Amino acid sequence: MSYPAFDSKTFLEAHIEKTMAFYFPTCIDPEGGFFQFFKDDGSVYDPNTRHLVSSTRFIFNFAQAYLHTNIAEYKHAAVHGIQYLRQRHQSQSGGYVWLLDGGTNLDETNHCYGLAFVILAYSNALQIGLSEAEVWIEVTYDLLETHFWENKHGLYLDEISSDWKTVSPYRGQNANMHMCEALMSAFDATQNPKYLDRAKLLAKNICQKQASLSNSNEVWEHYTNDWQIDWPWGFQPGHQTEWAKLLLMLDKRSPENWYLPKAKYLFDLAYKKAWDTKKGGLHYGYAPDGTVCDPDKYFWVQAESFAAAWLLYKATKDETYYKQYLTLWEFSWNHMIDHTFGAWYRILDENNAQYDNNKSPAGKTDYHTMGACYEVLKTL
């Protein structure tokens, strides 16, 4: 054995701990919230600009770490995060500031994607004991119901302007994926079956209905306001495998006989199309053609895929998925993970070369990789 035991509790916990150590305590802004732009070495390289997605995802980080390690200062960092979320990001209209610099808002557009992560963050707040979050979740859900929920399609639209008056013609799978995920987190935290029912409806609508609109029956990213397919461009493997994971997670909460075959199908297809057989890892995107059309290697794709693989292996006992889990971890250990400073590199080229030394710009808190580890951990 020349690799770590990627399927061991010890390894997964060790890796999470080293990733946590890259961000803590550097990301803490004594002024409020978190710094969101980190160099490979840990340096903050932009202390002012903040994005709702990192503001919420860091809440996920510290909350999950507290739930697993029971280290008190992690609960403190999560609460610090919640405070920043509610006092700085949560504006007037109930909507959340998308992007901001100091006391100035840069972008006040309402993104459904953002709202999903706001719900995710409130779930985590609740599970670490902020009793009030149950209400916050409940509030945010209705903001979405009122403004984003599109009952005749069973999906959420993507964005509305800050005034709440101009709706974007754009429809996208992404907001619905993360929305589904968030609502599962909400169901676990609250047991309110409303949320689980919405998660399963989103799952059905994206993975069955919207998927059927494609040749390969894979989930396409971009849709018209009809929710017809609008021809980044191409299929995104990471979202196929991410969906596989979500389906299996739903299949353990509220079973459905198409979940496992669909997860199985999406993963097999995505992995086979996107795995770089010479240098390793999954490419970022391929055409409906199946031609790889963006060969860069992203962290979240590797991570969501090894979570999906692990779940698939537990579900089927097919040793294929175990082996693929090991391949994804091997590639990751050898190329994505900074063994000096901790946490994952964001992106490599074709040849597994870094593009630069920006470990985590806004958006990346290593929510994806720690989350993937956490869910494999539940199965152990």
What is the experimental resolution, given in Å to one decimal place? 2.6
Domain residue ranges in the chain: 1-380
Structure letter (DSSP) for residue 34: B
CA-to-CA distance for 142 and 377, rounded, in angstroms?
33
CA-to-CA distance for 239 and 295, rounded, in angstroms?
16
Cross-strand partners of 3: none
Between CA 344 and CA 348, with CA 346 as vertex, the angle to 5 degrees is 110
Q: Compute the residue count for the chain.
A: 380
> Phi-psi bin for 338: left (phi > 0), alpha (psi -120 to 50), beta?
beta
CA-to-CA distance for 280 and 328, rounded, in angstroms?
8
Residues 38/19, Cβ–Cβ less than 8 Å: no
Domain 1-380: CATH class, spelled out: mainly alpha
Residue 104: phi, psi to the nearest 5?
Answer: -100, 135
- What is the rounded (10 degree) CA torsion for 264, 266, 268, 270? -160
Catalytic residue among 80, 239, 283, 335: 239
Residue 112 burial by CB count (10 A; 0-12/13-18/19+): exposed, middle or buried?
A: buried
Catalytic residue among 89, 147, 335, 368: 368
Between CA 189 and CA 192, with CA 191 as vertex, the angle to 5 degrees is 115
Query: Collapsing DSSP states into helix, strand and coil, what is residue 42?
Result: coil
How was this structure determined? It was done by X-ray
CA-to-CA distance for 317 and 266, rounded, in angstroms?
17
368 is annotated as an active-site residue:
yes
| Tokens matching residue 165 | 């008056």
